[PDB]
Design a protein around this ligand. Sequence first.
Ligand SMILES: Nc1ncnc2c1ncn2[C@@H]1O[C@H](COP(=O)(O)OP(=O)(O)OP(O)(O)=S)[C@@H](O)[C@H]1O
Ligand SMILES: Nc1ncnc2c1ncn2[C@@H]1O[C@H](COP(=O)(O)OP(=O)(O)OP(O)(O)=S)[C@@H](O)[C@H]1O
Ligand SMILES: Nc1ncnc2c1ncn2[C@@H]1O[C@H](COP(=O)(O)OP(=O)(O)O)[C@@H](O)[C@H]1O
Ligand SMILES: [Mg+2]
Ligand SMILES: [Mg+2]
Lengths: 23, 757, 116, 58, 116, 116
Amino acid sequence: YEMFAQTLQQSRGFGSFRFPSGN
Amino acid sequence: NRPNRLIVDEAINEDNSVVSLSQPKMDELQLFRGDTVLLKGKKRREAVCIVLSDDTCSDEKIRMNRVVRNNLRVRLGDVISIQPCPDVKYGKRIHVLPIDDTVEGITGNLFEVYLKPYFLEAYRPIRKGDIFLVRGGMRAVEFKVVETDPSPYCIVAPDTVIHCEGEPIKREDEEESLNEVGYDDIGGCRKQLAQIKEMVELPLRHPALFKAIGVKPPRGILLYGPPGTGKTLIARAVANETGAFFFLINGPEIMSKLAGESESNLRKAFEEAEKNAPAIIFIDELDAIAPKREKTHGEVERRIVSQLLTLMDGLKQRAHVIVMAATNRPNSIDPALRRFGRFDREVDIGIPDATGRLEILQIHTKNMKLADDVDLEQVANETHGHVGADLAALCSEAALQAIRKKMDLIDLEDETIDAEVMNSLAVTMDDFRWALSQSNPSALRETVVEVPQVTWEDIGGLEDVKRELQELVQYPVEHPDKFLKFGMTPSKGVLFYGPPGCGKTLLAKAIANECQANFISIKGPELLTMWFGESEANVREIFDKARQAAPCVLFFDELDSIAKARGGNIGDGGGAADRVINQILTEMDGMSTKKNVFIIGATNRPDIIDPAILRPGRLDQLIYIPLPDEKSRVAILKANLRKSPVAKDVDLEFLAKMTNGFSGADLTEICQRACKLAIRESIESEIRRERERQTNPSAMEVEEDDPVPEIRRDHFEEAMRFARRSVSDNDIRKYEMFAQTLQQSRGFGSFRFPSGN
Amino acid sequence: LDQLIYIPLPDEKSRVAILKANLRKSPVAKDVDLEFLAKMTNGFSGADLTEICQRACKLAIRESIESEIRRERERQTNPSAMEVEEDDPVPEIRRDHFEEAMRFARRSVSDNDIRK
Amino acid sequence: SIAKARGGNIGDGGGAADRVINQILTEMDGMSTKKNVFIIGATNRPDIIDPAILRPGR
Amino acid sequence: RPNSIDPALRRFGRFDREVDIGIPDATGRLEILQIHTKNMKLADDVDLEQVANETHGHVGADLAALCSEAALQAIRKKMDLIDLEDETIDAEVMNSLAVTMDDFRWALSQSNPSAL
Amino acid sequence: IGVKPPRGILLYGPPGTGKTLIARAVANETGAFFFLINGPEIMSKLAGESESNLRKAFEEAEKNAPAIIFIDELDAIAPKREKTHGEVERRIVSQLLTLMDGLKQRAHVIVMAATN
Ligand SMILES: Nc1ncnc2c1ncn2[C@@H]1O[C@H](COP(=O)(O)OP(=O)(O)OP(O)(O)=S)[C@@H](O)[C@H]1O
Ligand SMILES: Nc1ncnc2c1ncn2[C@@H]1O[C@H](COP(=O)(O)OP(=O)(O)OP(O)(O)=S)[C@@H](O)[C@H]1O
Ligand SMILES: Nc1ncnc2c1ncn2[C@@H]1O[C@H](COP(=O)(O)OP(=O)(O)O)[C@@H](O)[C@H]1O
Ligand SMILES: [Mg+2]
Ligand SMILES: [Mg+2]
C-alpha cells in the first residue's frame, strides 16, 4: 500500500515554483 | 642555556650570506634584522652574515645556507656562538681566485659575467677565508676569498674595487666541494627524508650517547620504489650529511665476479666497514643478489644469499654500523631478509606529485639560463606520471632543442669557445611544449596516491550529506577522546547509491580534501580484470598500500560491476557470490580500526549488490544522492565554467530554472557544446579575415589585430536545443522504492519515557 | 551433527538483558527506563537493539561536539575571563536521545520468515 | 564481433561482458590526451554493443 | 612452518616431538610489555593493560619495536633535552625522562603487525 | 654545454631491415672509432674468454674516444631471466650491466645495439 501510495506521488522539483518579481 | 649558542638547521632561502632566526629568540637576544652578525665555528674560522626574522624558524636553532655550513667545518646538530658587530665597515680591495676543477671547461672573463651582478645591490658581507658559489650560464663555479686589505669582517660596497688577477689555484685538501650531494638537491619526498633522518641521525651523530641510552637501534632499512626515484641520491645525501664512512656495494659488480671472489668482496666490505665505525653500507639492487628461492637455480647464488644472511645476523655486535638497501619492488626479495634483526624497517619512496615535480624542475633548472616566457608551474601541472629522471631528461631535451634551433649559434661557435654565447642563450616556452610531445613516461600504470584538490565549493548543496560525511570521517581523527569516554566503536564504511552522473566521486574527493588525507581510487575495469584473470590476490596488495599511506580514503567505484557482468543477478544460477568481493570482505574483517583507513563504495544498481557487504562491521551506512536541486544546478554551472571566458551578459540563474531534472553530466555536456560552438566561430572567422581579405596587403599589417569572440548568449541559446535528459522517470522511481525499503520506522515516532511523581 | 536446536527471537527479559549488556561501556543516565523500552520492542532481534543503542550514542556525540565548538570558539575570541568559566562537559546519554533515535528503528525479520 | 559470437546478447546468460573490450576500455582510460591518437569504431549492430563504451571520456 | 620440512625428518628416532609456540594473547602481551618496560622509566599517565588490550595480532617482536618507537618519540619530542645534551653525557637526563600515554597512542598508528 | 648526452640507443625491427647498415653508415659519416661486437662470436667462446673480450672491447673503445660501439643481436647475449639457465650466461649479463653503468665517466662513448 505504501508503494501504491508513492506511485501517485505529488511532484518532483515543482516545490520551489515562484512567480518572478521585477520592477 | 645561554641564547648565543645555536644549533645548525637547514635554511629555505638560497642566498649565500643570509642566515635566519626566530622572533622570540631574537627579542631575548636583543637584535634586529638590519644587523650584520658574525659567527664563530671550529678551527678559528668565521663567517659574517646578515640575519633576518622568520616565523617558520625554530627557537633554539639557526637556519643557514650550505655554503655558510661548509665554510665553518660545522655540520648539522653542532654549536655555533654568535657575536654582534656594529664595527663592520667598508672594504678597500677584494681579491678572489677561481678554482681549477670548476673552470676546466669555461673560458674567458668571469668578472663582469659572474662577479659584477653577484655583489650588485645585495651588500654582501664577505671575509678572508670563505668560499662562495655562483650559479648561472649552465654552470656553477666557486670562488675563494684569498686576500683582502681591511679587517676580515667587511661589507662589500659598490665603491670597493674587486681584483680578479691571478691563476686558478687548487683548494686546501680539507675543503669540500660540489662533488658530494646535500639535502637541497632532493625534492618531493620531505616526509620520507624526515623519517630517514629520525632513524639514522640520532644513532650515528651521537654514538656514545646512544650507547649510554642502551635502547637498541634499527640496523636494516629497506628503501623501495619505482625505478628512477633517486634512492641512491638520498642514501648518498644522508651519508654526506652525517659524514660517516660511506661504502658502496653494487649488486651486478658482485655477481659479475667468480665463485669465491663474491664472498671475499662481501667479507672484506663488512670488515673494512666495521673498522671505520660509525659507517653506512649501501647495497644497491638487492634483488640481483638475493631473489626468491624458486628463481635462484644453482648452488653458488644460494650460497651467496646464505653468506649475506650470515653476515647480517653476525652484524649484531653493537658496532654502530647501519646497512641500507634499495630495490624496485618489495616482493622479489627472499623473505628471510624480512625477519627481525635484519631488513625490517621499510620506507616507501613513491612517485612525486605536482608540488614535488615543481621542486624537481626548480632543482634541474638552476644553472641553465631561462627566458621569461616559461612558467614552470604549468609544466609541473601538465607532466602526469613523471618520475624525476623523466623530468631531468625533459630539461635535457628542451635545452638540446634550444641549442639545435639556433643553428646561427652553431655558426657562432664552430670550434671556438665563448662563455658569452652560453650566456646569450635561453629556453623558450615552445621548447618545453615540444618536449612534452616526445616524452615517454614510465609511471602511467602506477596507482596514484595523493591528496585531492576538489573542495566543497565545486559541489552544490548536499548539506546534510556533507554534515553526515564529516561526522563519520573527521570526528574520530580529531577527537578520539570522546570515543574513549562514551565508549563506542567508530564505523568503518559508507555505501553511496543513486542515479548516474551526480557527484559521488566528487564527494569522496571533497571529504578527502576536507580531512587532508590520501585518496586511492579503484575503478570498475580493475575489478573486472581481477575477475576475468582470476588474480584476486592483488586485493591484499591494495590494502597494504592503503595501510602504508594512513590516514587514507579508499574508494571502490562501481562495486556492482562483477554482479552486473555475471548475469545481472539472473544468469549462471548463482546468487551474490564472487571471488573478488569475497577477498574484499576478508580484508575488511582483517584490518585494525586504529589505522584510520576509511572505505567508500558507490553503485548505480543497489538491488543486485551482495547483501553480505551491508552487515555491521562493514559498509553499513547507506546514503542516497538524488538529482541536484536548483541552487545545486547553479553551483554546477558555475564550477564547470571557471576555466572559460564567459561574457557577463549570460544569466545562469535563468539557465538553472529551465533544466528541471538534469544531472551534472548533462550540464557539463551543454557547457562543452557551447564551448565547441565558440571555437568553431573563432576559427572560421580568423581564417576568412586573414586569408580571404587580401593576399597582397593594402596596409602593412592586419588592421584589426583583435580576436573577436568570447562565449556569449547565442552560443548557449543554440547549444540548448541539443540537450537531453539522461535519466528517465521509471529509473528515479526505482531509486525511490529502494530508498523506501530502508525506511526509518512505523509508529515509533511518538515514543516517550513515562513521567510519574 | 545430529542435535538440532532452534533459537527464536528474544523474549522480554532477554531484551532487557541485551539492552543492559550493550550499554555497559556507555555512560547512561539513571533516568532511563529500560524495562519500558523492552515492552515496546515486540519482535526485534539483538542486532536491532544494538543498532538503536549505537544510534542514540551517535546523537549524543553530535550534541557534545556541536556544543563544545560553539562554547569554545563562538563565545569570545579575546577572552573576558582568564580561562573558560564553565570547564564542564555537558552531555551524557539521556532520555531525549533514545526518544529521538526510536523513530529510526525497524524490524529486520518479517512474519513469513518466522513462519518458515 | 565478440558480442555477436557469444550469444548475440542472448546466449550464455551474461550481458555486455568481455575480456577484450575490458582491456580496450582500460587502455583508453590509461592514455594521455597530448599524444593525438584518435580512436574510431564501427558496427553493424549498435544495439548489442557494450553500453560502457559510450560513456564520456571514451 | 611444519610443512616445508623434508618428511624423512618426521620419523621415529628423529624429530618426532612437536611443540607449537603460537601467538600470545592479551595476558601474554601484557607480560611482554612488562618485560620490555623494566629498565625504561615510565610516567604514570600510561596504562599498559589498555595497550595490551588494543594491540591485536602482535607478536612479541612487534611489541619490542613498539616500545622502541615510543621511547624514540619521547626522546625526539624533547628537543630541549637534545639541547640539554649536545655532546655531554648525564645520567640524570635519562633519569629525568619518562614516556607519556600519547607516545604509545602515536606508536599504535605507525605499527604494522604481522599476524592478522 | 654540460647537458648530459644519451649513451644507449636501441634499434629494433623485423629481420632484414638493415640496422647494421644504418649503424655502419652513421659510423662512417661521423668518422669516429667504430668497433663491432657480434653476439654469437662472444657466446661461442669459453667461460672467461667472453668477459675478457667484453672488457678489452670497452677498454680499447675508451682509449680512442670519441667512439661508437655496436652490439649486434643483443638477445643472444642478454635474454629474459627465465631463459638464461646456467650460471655463466647470467654472469655475462651481469658483466654487461656492470660495464654499461661504469661507462658514465664523460668519455664520449656511444653504445648502439640492435635486436629483432
Ligand atoms: N626526486 C628527485 N630529486 C632529485 N633528483 C632526482 C629525483 N628523482 C630523480 N632524480 C634524478 O634522476 C636520476 C635518478 O638516479 P638514481 O638515483 O639512480 O634513481 P634510482 O631510483 O636509483 O634509479 P635506479 O632504481 O637505481 S635504476 C638522477 O640523475 C637524479 O639526480
Ligand atoms: N632499407 C634498406 N636500405 C638498403 N639496403 C637494405 C635495406 N633493407 C635491407 N637492405 C639490404 O638487405 C641486407 C640486410 O642486411 P642487414 O643489415 O643485416 O639487415 P638486418 O636488419 O641487420 O638483418 P639482421 O636482423 O641483422 S639478420 C643488406 O644486404 C642490405 O644492403
Ligand atoms: N555538486 C556538483 N557540482 C558540480 N558538478 C557536479 C556535482 N555533482 C556532479 N557533478 C558533475 O558530475 C560529474 C562527475 O560524475 P560522478 O558523480 O563522478 O558520476 P558517478 O557517480 O557515476 O561516478 C562531474 O563532471 C561534475 O561536473
Ligand atoms: Mg640504484
Ligand atoms: Mg645484425
